[PDB]
Write an enzyme that holds these catalytic residues in place. Structure first.
Site, PDB file in Angstrom:
ATOM      1  N   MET A   1       1.041  -1.279  -0.012  1.00  0.00           N
ATOM      2  CA  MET A   1       0.074  -0.109  -0.073  1.00  0.00           C
ATOM      3  C   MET A   1       0.851   1.327   0.046  1.00  0.00           C
ATOM      4  O   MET A   1       0.705   2.295  -0.709  1.00  0.00           O
ATOM      5  CB  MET A   1      -0.935   0.191   1.164  1.00  0.00           C
ATOM      6  CG  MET A   1      -1.760  -1.114   1.197  1.00  0.00           C
ATOM      7  SD  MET A   1      -2.903  -1.358  -0.356  1.00  0.00           S
ATOM      8  CE  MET A   1      -4.081   0.003   0.070  1.00  0.00           C
TER       9      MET A   1
ATOM     10  N   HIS B   1       9.997   6.187  16.906  1.00  0.00           N
ATOM     11  CA  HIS B   1       8.663   5.837  16.185  1.00  0.00           C
ATOM     12  C   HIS B   1       7.822   4.925  17.115  1.00  0.00           C
ATOM     13  O   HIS B   1       8.405   3.820  17.185  1.00  0.00           O
ATOM     14  CB  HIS B   1       8.883   5.621  14.745  1.00  0.00           C
ATOM     15  CG  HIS B   1       7.422   5.556  14.098  1.00  0.00           C
ATOM     16  ND1 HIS B   1       6.592   6.529  14.037  1.00  0.00           N
ATOM     17  CD2 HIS B   1       6.801   4.627  13.271  1.00  0.00           C
ATOM     18  CE1 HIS B   1       5.615   6.238  13.537  1.00  0.00           C
ATOM     19  NE2 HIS B   1       5.643   5.009  13.001  1.00  0.00           N
TER      20      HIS B   1
ATOM     21  N   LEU C   1      12.235   6.042   8.671  1.00  0.00           N
ATOM     22  CA  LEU C   1      11.039   7.202   8.872  1.00  0.00           C
ATOM     23  C   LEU C   1      10.454   7.059  10.291  1.00  0.00           C
ATOM     24  O   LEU C   1      10.565   6.100  10.845  1.00  0.00           O
ATOM     25  CB  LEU C   1       9.761   6.488   7.935  1.00  0.00           C
ATOM     26  CG  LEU C   1       8.539   7.025   7.841  1.00  0.00           C
ATOM     27  CD1 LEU C   1       8.573   8.905   7.382  1.00  0.00           C
ATOM     28  CD2 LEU C   1       7.152   6.387   7.498  1.00  0.00           C
TER      29      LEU C   1
HETATM   30  N1  LIG Z   1       8.168   4.048   9.931  1.00  0.00           N
HETATM   31  C1  LIG Z   1       6.861   4.378   9.854  1.00  0.00           C
HETATM   32  O1  LIG Z   1       6.578   5.767  10.304  1.00  0.00           O
HETATM   33  C2  LIG Z   1       5.834   3.662   9.530  1.00  0.00           C
HETATM   34  C3  LIG Z   1       5.994   2.151   9.062  1.00  0.00           C
HETATM   35  N2  LIG Z   1       4.955   1.349   8.696  1.00  0.00           N
HETATM   36  C4  LIG Z   1       5.313  -0.064   8.101  1.00  0.00           C
HETATM   37  O2  LIG Z   1       5.809  -0.055   6.921  1.00  0.00           O
HETATM   38  C5  LIG Z   1       5.648  -1.352   6.418  1.00  0.00           C
HETATM   39  C6  LIG Z   1       4.810  -1.477   5.037  1.00  0.00           C
HETATM   40  O3  LIG Z   1       3.381  -0.779   5.385  1.00  0.00           O
HETATM   41  P1  LIG Z   1       2.354  -1.299   4.239  1.00  0.00           P
HETATM   42  O4  LIG Z   1       2.825  -0.921   2.789  1.00  0.00           O
HETATM   43  O5  LIG Z   1       0.936  -0.632   4.256  1.00  0.00           O
HETATM   44  O6  LIG Z   1       2.423  -2.955   4.306  1.00  0.00           O
HETATM   45  P2  LIG Z   1       1.896  -3.892   3.034  1.00  0.00           P
HETATM   46  O7  LIG Z   1       1.739  -5.260   3.664  1.00  0.00           O
HETATM   47  O8  LIG Z   1       0.786  -3.367   2.288  1.00  0.00           O
HETATM   48  O9  LIG Z   1       3.183  -4.010   1.940  1.00  0.00           O
HETATM   49  C7  LIG Z   1       4.345  -4.806   2.287  1.00  0.00           C
HETATM   50  C8  LIG Z   1       4.868  -5.798   1.203  1.00  0.00           C
HETATM   51  O10 LIG Z   1       6.203  -6.264   1.513  1.00  0.00           O
HETATM   52  C9  LIG Z   1       6.178  -7.453   0.636  1.00  0.00           C
HETATM   53  N3  LIG Z   1       7.145  -8.524   1.044  1.00  0.00           N
HETATM   54  C10 LIG Z   1       7.454  -9.422   2.154  1.00  0.00           C
HETATM   55  N4  LIG Z   1       8.766  -9.637   2.103  1.00  0.00           N
HETATM   56  C11 LIG Z   1       9.423  -9.175   0.966  1.00  0.00           C
HETATM   57  C12 LIG Z   1      10.745  -8.867   0.451  1.00  0.00           C
HETATM   58  N5  LIG Z   1      11.780  -9.925   1.005  1.00  0.00           N
HETATM   59  N6  LIG Z   1      11.125  -8.185  -0.657  1.00  0.00           N
HETATM   60  C13 LIG Z   1      10.127  -7.438  -1.087  1.00  0.00           C
HETATM   61  N7  LIG Z   1       8.797  -7.439  -0.831  1.00  0.00           N
HETATM   62  C14 LIG Z   1       8.567  -8.258   0.520  1.00  0.00           C
HETATM   63  C15 LIG Z   1       4.596  -7.982   0.676  1.00  0.00           C
HETATM   64  O11 LIG Z   1       4.424  -9.054  -0.192  1.00  0.00           O
HETATM   65  C16 LIG Z   1       4.040  -6.816   0.722  1.00  0.00           C
HETATM   66  O12 LIG Z   1       3.642  -6.661  -0.741  1.00  0.00           O
HETATM   67  C17 LIG Z   1       5.260  -2.280   7.698  1.00  0.00           C
HETATM   68  O13 LIG Z   1       6.168  -2.823   8.493  1.00  0.00           O
HETATM   69  C18 LIG Z   1       4.337  -1.015   8.460  1.00  0.00           C
HETATM   70  O14 LIG Z   1       4.373  -1.301   9.936  1.00  0.00           O
HETATM   71  C19 LIG Z   1       3.883   2.071   8.404  1.00  0.00           C
HETATM   72  C20 LIG Z   1       3.603   3.230   8.668  1.00  0.00           C
HETATM   73  C21 LIG Z   1       4.740   3.939   9.138  1.00  0.00           C
END
Ligand SMILES: NC(=O)C1=CN([C@@H]2O[C@H](COP(=O)(O)OP(=O)(O)OC[C@H]3O[C@@H](n4cnc5c(N)ncnc54)[C@H](O)[C@@H]3O)[C@@H](O)[C@H]2O)C=CC1
Ligand SMILES: NC(=O)C1=CN([C@@H]2O[C@H](COP(=O)(O)OP(=O)(O)OC[C@H]3O[C@@H](n4cnc5c(N)ncnc54)[C@H](O)[C@@H]3O)[C@@H](O)[C@H]2O)C=CC1
Ligand SMILES: NC(=O)C1=CN([C@@H]2O[C@H](COP(=O)(O)OP(=O)(O)OC[C@H]3O[C@@H](n4cnc5c(N)ncnc54)[C@H](O)[C@@H]3O)[C@@H](O)[C@H]2O)C=CC1
Ligand SMILES: NC(=O)C1=CN([C@@H]2O[C@H](COP(=O)(O)OP(=O)(O)OC[C@H]3O[C@@H](n4cnc5c(N)ncnc54)[C@H](O)[C@@H]3O)[C@@H](O)[C@H]2O)C=CC1
Lengths: 315, 315, 315, 315
Positions: free
Chosen positions: D13, D181, D149
């Site tokens: 996403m 964070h 981030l």
């Molecule tokens: N640091 C921050 O301020 C924030 C961090 N996040 C984090 O960001 C991360 C992503 O969030 P979203 O995109 O909504 O998650 P999402 O689940 O929609 O996308 C994550 C993607 O990673 C893929 N993935 C798994 N193993 C992989 C690999 N080895 N290589 C490439 N892709 C792989 C999955 O198939 C999936 O499409 C989460 O851990 C979430 O908690 C979310 C908001 C803020």
């Protein structure tokens, strides 16, 4: 404010991208309306934080109440279904959903007529050339104040695929797709240009062949299907196309943009909506442009209108 | 930084607007070079404050030292004279200044060859189709790394005047002016489009007449003179046209833009520069496009080249 | 259109840059008004061509007729003189021009009252804190609908010079200069921040010294003089500052911006205009912010107001 | 081209919104990499059409092959899980996923070290202050070339909620959230400003109360939870925050931005990553800024670091 008020009737995948781009461009305040409880409040909150990064000042608020249509300047309708329940991704098309999406357009048109009769309306729900006319009839708005998405999106594809082959800026390819959005869309080879030059010059020079262009045409018609079959869904380009249309309206740019509009004799046709270049500015549809098509191109336009008329009867 | 370094050789009226637009667009660091003492430091200081309002971070510095060419990525040459001293505004044209502006191009080419042989060069000084070739020869740069301003500016006028008559977005008119910048410029009626549609369709519909278009053509050719006779001088549109060219280079947009470039057989002509559509990207002039002109249009192109050759001999 | 109409009363050096930036930003239609015959038509024509390069659709037209104020949404006043005739560049300041520029403000205020009483007005003509009040009184507009340029420009300088020493994005330095525009401007050391952090932290860390900051303060006060003495004139940053103010109004951004505004008790002062942070949105001056100054800072504010009152009496 | 190459490791996403904004801003070519077959090709195709609407020229391509990291200028890591499988939305937090997301960071770091050791890296995967250090250690990159981030996103919320109460432009509120964070983030009341003015002035004036600000602080800490409980998910603001960071790098803006970075003595802490203002430009992390915190604020910073150390041991 006298900031524009933009109401997104439907808060799904296209809705979320539209809200994002409106804040990026500081175009006006946004309402995410949907029938799903709570979800539009969640998306709106997320999106509202981006004013900081964008140096904008647009409110973004969710709604589950139709009366929040009151005072709208622009209404964008994506409400309805995206697939039929129980058909597979290989057979994706249009026929059982029609009376149901008819019902949704009728309900929305009534709330428009009561709450914002002077709004500019853009219809997206498929099949778009049918749904836009149904909404026109039930909302009561003037013919210059309602359009449907089709040609900006379909031509974005054709323009982009040609620009990749010729190695030029995508926006330097211009092209026309008319009649309807969907499998009967009419791709006009004779109206394609590159940097304002007839594409035929680039064909005579062997920079792109007739056979390459036939394959690009088939690709353009089948793009929505190609994306479904890659385990995704088209919503990013659809959102960007709609926001280009709404922005031409709001800023009185007067861009020439291919949209679905009421035909009153153009191409031989009346009492139906179909895709053609129009001019969008502060008075809405300021001009409807009729391409001087030949008999072979007219015959394809006729097939596209006939398919809109067929589905209209089933709705 | 690996921010681009853009050196404006000449800090007059066009130079000042270019510096302003580079900061607005955050395109790179800027040097305002001139032979006039102190003045380029003054303009640079004024312009540097606008980073705050623009949310940019571009240095802007003046220079009276040729060696500040060192490390340039883009060199833009406006240095020379704008009128002849002792002719009146009614008789403004090109003949006594030629050896003198020849001298200026030769001096600048030597400093380019020594300090920044890998820079992308844009020449503006008039008569541009002559001066650009002189600078090419004395700087030693490759033919794909030097161009002259002409067609982006001349067509901006033609496109704008037509868009006002037809009530459409100015950028939706496309058009071609070739051969040379100046009174022999070749305006190609057959290559004008509106929203990608042949202009002839709008003529058949009586939205614009052949006679109206003849008057717009004469207006386009005489625009620089029209502005001089209103007690002003053209520099704002010239600056914006040059920055569109330099931005296509720097960002690898690959836009199709009409510029003066070395001809190697196109239109029958070799060993001279003339105006034609080219593609500008990260490798400079990536493609030179040859319009498939008819014999009547070729005959006008020949007259334009002959006038460049005449003035070249006097330089 | 319901595009905004922006009338530039005065078509000199600041006027020409404002017109350029309005087209770049597609903010509204533009009128270049001046008493000089023909010149504003020439500048307008030049500037109108840039809609093509900018993908905008703003009319730009010249005027020598006061009645073209009719229907204005925003009026920007630069009309008057920039130097006294017969003083040298070393002694540039304010005293003989005052009754003459008084006369110009009075004439313009009468035409505003008749033709566009509901317009939002920005005054630039120097000495600005005097001229803005004179125009307020003769135009009849509400106190929330007229402001003068000062602090956005003066602070752009201070913010920029500090950002160059600390090597950070210019817009990440925030700072306040109050009271009046001119040699008595009050620079508030205690209200300077870098990335929202008190500047005193960077002083404690030896990243910038107290002595460096004293020299930057003197530089800020004397910047207009520094530019005159380098054989140029400040108009680019002045134009950009004014367009940031007008854009906050037109788009209802509600930015906090230091401008000259009617004081009604803030800082102890009434019945005069002076520089202070205000909020600019769709209702004009939406909020007047009073800094909680200490007695030493108040004493400097008092000196600035006293100098505005002195020159007002001579006008 | 020497266009930047930006590889999005993770095409979920957040990935989809990042790709959209990169094309809107013409920042560079994009690779959507994921382990899910076909899906990244589908999203890339959809997104590639928007170059037309945006007047950009950025390639967008999908990938299921790690070696497509070769030649990357910027690598953005979102790969991993967003919720634990079998916990409910009410109890959303961080503990069983840690070794699994450890494994993902280790695998990705190996491919970075082999294919693009000179890339600038941004880590997003939660818990971010732990995952960023793990990736640092396994990728081998210099400490000035990797960040996480946190603070840009957390402060976007706090800044936005205050701006709505005070009726000012969102970007005119500045504020600092440090340490980590997550639920131990440290909100610094003393470092909040409005138009560069201490927020305490607005509290003394009764424009916003201490109690209102306490409720806004709790709201800021619990925002991700508030969005989950409204039947949506935070990804739009996260994407916009990451693109502001990557854009500062690519364009050498040198913005002050709160990010997770290796601590080497600041705040008393070494050998760990935590959130603090840094300067991002062409050399990466150009400066690490240490706030001159008091003992009460230091004690909260210590609690945040202790929680990162706890989860690191479990990974
Ligand atoms: N640091 C921050 O301020 C924030 C961090 N996040 C984090 O960001 C991360 C992503 O969030 P979203 O995109 O909504 O998650 P999402 O689940 O929609 O996308 C994550 C993607 O990673 C893929 N993935 C798994 N193993 C992989 C690999 N080895 N290589 C490439 N892709 C792989 C999955 O198939 C999936 O499409 C989460 O851990 C979430 O908690 C979310 C908001 C803020
Ligand atoms: N005209 C064109 O060029 C294109 C049209 N489309 C069409 O756009 C429509 C939307 O597509 P997506 O956003 O991806 O669909 P989506 O399913 O993600 O979102 C549609 C939303 O409408 C809502 N809805 C149902 N009844 C409603 C009502 N009465 N009022 C408000 N909301 C209501 C649903 O709960 C849902 O959230 C579909 O019909 C699709 O086929 C898609 C691409 C292009
Ligand atoms: N190619 C085209 O489409 C157009 C070309 N032009 C041409 O552009 C040129 C510049 O026009 P404007 O800026 O309005 O002229 P301008 O006279 O205001 O500025 C020219 C500057 O060049 C400086 N100069 C002289 N010798 C120099 C040297 N060796 N190195 C650096 N600077 C030197 C002068 O001191 C002056 O400041 C003219 O030749 C004019 O005819 C103007 C419009 C369009
Ligand atoms: N408030 C501030 O922060 C700043 C104020 N200024 C002031 O701005 C003013 C303009 O500066 P520049 O544009 O460089 O001056 P400029 O002299 O180039 O232009 C002023 C124009 O006003 C015209 N004018 C005279 N009477 C007029 C009337 N009744 N109606 C319309 N036009 C009339 C003149 O013909 C001239 O074209 C000056 O008073 C200057 O001191 C300059 C910088 C900053």
């Amino acid at each position: 404010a006298p900031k524009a008020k933009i109401v997104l009737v439907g808060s799904g995948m296209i809705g979320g991208v539209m809200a994002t781009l409106i804040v990026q461009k500081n175009l006006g305040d946004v309402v995410l309306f949907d029938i799903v409880k709570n979800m539009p409040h969640g998306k709106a909150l997320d999106t509202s934080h981006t004013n900081v990064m964008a140096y904008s000042n647009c409110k973004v608020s969710g709604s589950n109440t139709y009366d929040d249509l009151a005072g709208a300047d622009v209404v964008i309708v994506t409400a309805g279904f995206t697939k039929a329940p129980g058909k597979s991704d290989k057979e994706w098309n249009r026929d059982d959903l029609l009376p149901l999406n008819n019902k949704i357009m009728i309900e929305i048109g009534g709330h428009i007529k009561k709450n914002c009769p002077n709004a500019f309306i853009i219809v997206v729900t498929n099949p778009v050339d049918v749904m836009v006319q149904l909404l026109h009839q039930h909302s009561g708005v003037p013919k210059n104040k309602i359009i449907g998405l089709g040609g900006v999106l379909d031509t974005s594809r054709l323009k982009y695929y040609i620009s990749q082959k010729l190695n030029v800026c995508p926006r330097d390819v211009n092209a026309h797709i008319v009649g309807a959005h969907g499998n009967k869309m009419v791709l006009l080879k004779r109206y394609i240009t590159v940097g304002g030059i007839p594409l035929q010059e680039f064909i005579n020079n062997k920079l792109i062949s007739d056979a390459e262009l036939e394959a690009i045409f088939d690709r353009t018609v089948n793009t929505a299907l190609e994306i479904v079959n890659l385990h995704a869904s088209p919503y990013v380009a659809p959102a960007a196309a709609i926001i280009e249309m709404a922005e031409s309206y709001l800023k009185d740019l007067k861009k020439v943009l291919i949209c679905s509009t009421l035909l009153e004799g153009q191409y031989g046709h009346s009492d139906i909506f179909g895709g053609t270049p129009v001019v969008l500015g502060a008075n809405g549809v300021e001009q409807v442009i009729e391409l001087q098509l030949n008999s072979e191109e007219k015959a394809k336009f006729d097939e596209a209108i006939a398919e809109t008329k067929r589905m209209k009867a089933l709705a």
